[PDB]
Design a protein around this ligand. Structure first.
Ligand SMILES: O=C(NCc1ccc(Cl)cc1)[C@@H]1C[C@@H](O)CN1C(=O)c1ccccc1Cl
Lengths: 87, 134, 104
């Protein structure tokens, strides 16, 4: 049901498997209930997990989708993580 | 090739920008050429005079980011609800970076060659209109 | 109406949704299913204020306006070491680097 995503600094992120499967890389890595990201920091992986919940909630909606916020400070690193994760 | 039908049949449309972006409406003329129209501020509506069978698309007026209209890419006249798509986290990140860095300076950011080429490959209407031949 | 949360204890963060009408005790049962710890060994917090089991998540401040998908609300978690509860501790996330001159 849930999966553990561990960042470079040991922060464990428990997320629904359906949500983590948004990332094609994670989807592949999950075929284990834990995935270690030796490259992604916590401030980055937390915003990725937020993207997963945002994506699952807003995909095929018909309402009004809000902008996904990204702080300037995280923008570069999040780009590298998103590029790695096929997100 | 992906053009407007010259119906000559008036159709009243209401463009509703249900997005945080400034929308640029783009009409594809009888020759398939994209014709830009006056921009819609963030939460604004506009009663426009169009025609049945005419083709429309909506993009971000500044960055040219793609937008949806009634959950799809193209609009054929009536309510035209312009919304943000759920962009990928990669596209969203590229958008933010592009909005903070001058095109010339993209080569100065400490990232992989692929990402430099991803930033350089700006959203374009002509490029989109070509992807819509498949 | 759903609400979006980050349930946080030490270096552990659970990402879940719940109804505004869901009670604090019902959230404890969600944590129980994940962290394998009973509600009686659990303590939940909003901004370091201990939440009552019978109170709804809306009454506890988690609403559609505050607990969004892209920006979830934080619920603090603490476990009992038999007896006595451990002090609430949430390890802060890693710090981002100094913004590049090129992106300032
Ligand atoms: O211009 C037009 N309507 C006025 C208007 C003003 C401002 C805004 Cl934001 C939107 C609409 C229409 C729309 C399109 O079908 C184009 N069109 C025509 O009246 C037309 C018809 C045949 C050939 C060429 C043209 Cl321009």
């Amino acid at each position: 049901m849930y999966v553990k995503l561990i960042s470079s600094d040991g922060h464990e992120f428990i997320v629904k498997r359906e949500h983590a499967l948004t990332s094609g890389t994670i989807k592949a890595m999950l075929s284990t209930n834990e995935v270690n990201f030796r490259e992604i920091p916590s401030h980055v992986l937390s915003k990725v997990c937020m993207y997963f919940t945002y994506k699952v909630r807003y995909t095929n909606s018909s309402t009004e989708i809000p902008e996904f916020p990204i702080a300037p400070e995280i923008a570069l690193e999040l780009l590298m993580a998103a590029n790695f994760l096929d997100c | 090739v992906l053009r407007s039908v010259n119906s000559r049949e008036p159709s009243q449309v209401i463009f509703c920008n249900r997005s945080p972006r400034v929308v640029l409406p783009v009409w594809l003329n009888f020759d398939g050429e994209p014709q830009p129209y006056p921009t819609l501020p963030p939460g604004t509506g506009r009663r426009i005079h169009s025609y049945r069978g005419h083709l429309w698309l909506f993009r971000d007026a500044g960055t040219h980011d793609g937008l949806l209209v009634n959950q799809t890419e193209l609009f054929v006249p009536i309510f035209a609800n312009i919304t943000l798509p759920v962009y990928t986290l990669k596209e969203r990140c590229l958008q933010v970076v592009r909005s903070l860095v001058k095109p010339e300076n993209y080569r100065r950011l400490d990232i992989v060659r692929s990402l430099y080429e991803d930033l350089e490959d700006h959203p374009n209407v002509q490029k989109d209109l070509e992807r819509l031949t498949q | 109406m759903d609400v979006f949360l980050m349930i946080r204890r030490h270096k552990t963060t659970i990402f879940t949704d719940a109804k505004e009408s869901s009670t604090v005790f019902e959230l404890k049962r969600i944590v129980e299913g994940i962290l394998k710890r009973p509600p009686d060994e659990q303590r939940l917090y909003k901004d370091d204020q201990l939440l009552d089991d019978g109170k709804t998540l809306g009454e506890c401040g988690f609403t559609s306006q505050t607990a969004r998908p892209q920006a979830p609300a934080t619920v603090g978690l603490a476990f009992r070491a038999d007896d006595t509860f451990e002090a609430l501790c949430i390890e802060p996330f890693s710090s981002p680097p100094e913004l590049p001159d090129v992106m300032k």
